[PDB]
Amino acid sequence: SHMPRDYTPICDNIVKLTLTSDGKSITLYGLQYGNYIITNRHLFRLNNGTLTIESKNGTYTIADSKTLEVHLIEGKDLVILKMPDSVPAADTTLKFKKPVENEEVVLVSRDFSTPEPKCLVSESSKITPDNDGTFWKHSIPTKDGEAGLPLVSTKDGTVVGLHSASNFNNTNFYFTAIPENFMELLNDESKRKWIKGWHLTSNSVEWGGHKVFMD
């Protein structure tokens, strides 16, 4: 028996990032946590751009991804973005935990299109680790550009991972698991190592015992 849950607090902290530079953009989702935005590493396929963060509070525009300070999660398609101090921070109400096998998750998505936003909760699905643990597999159909959307456990309502990649036939879907002591990484600066100008210049990346493409 698991407690019935309202997923609206998690929806209120989902943000839509769009890194645009010279007519080419990369749009995927993220999560708002204080002065930080947790999102996928493959958001930075291009360097020197303009980040557009769309939150429930407002829409923000940021100077140059090269100057941006980012903490990279080791061996995972995850990155912590340090927003400049002028941007208002979000709630620290989001709860991150390492996923547990045989624990069901639901993809929580916010629909920015409709005049009234919809806190969408997908159908439940089990999770299993893939190869070295860089990727975790779920059975929730995800459209393109839906990476960074939170995988939320139905037991305790914690974000256990963010969506990342899928196969070309769109039959298996892989998300990036939240690492151990990830909440310790958010509230303790001594564990954070910030880097600037990180970008993914390569077309093909070899991650998680797989060959992942950008398109």
Binding site: L28, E146, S164, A165, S166, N167, F168, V212, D215
Partner: peptide, 7 residues
């Protein structure tokens, strides 16, 4: 194993 593409 199987090839993937980012989303």
């Amino acid at each position: 194993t199987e090839n993937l593409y980012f989303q």
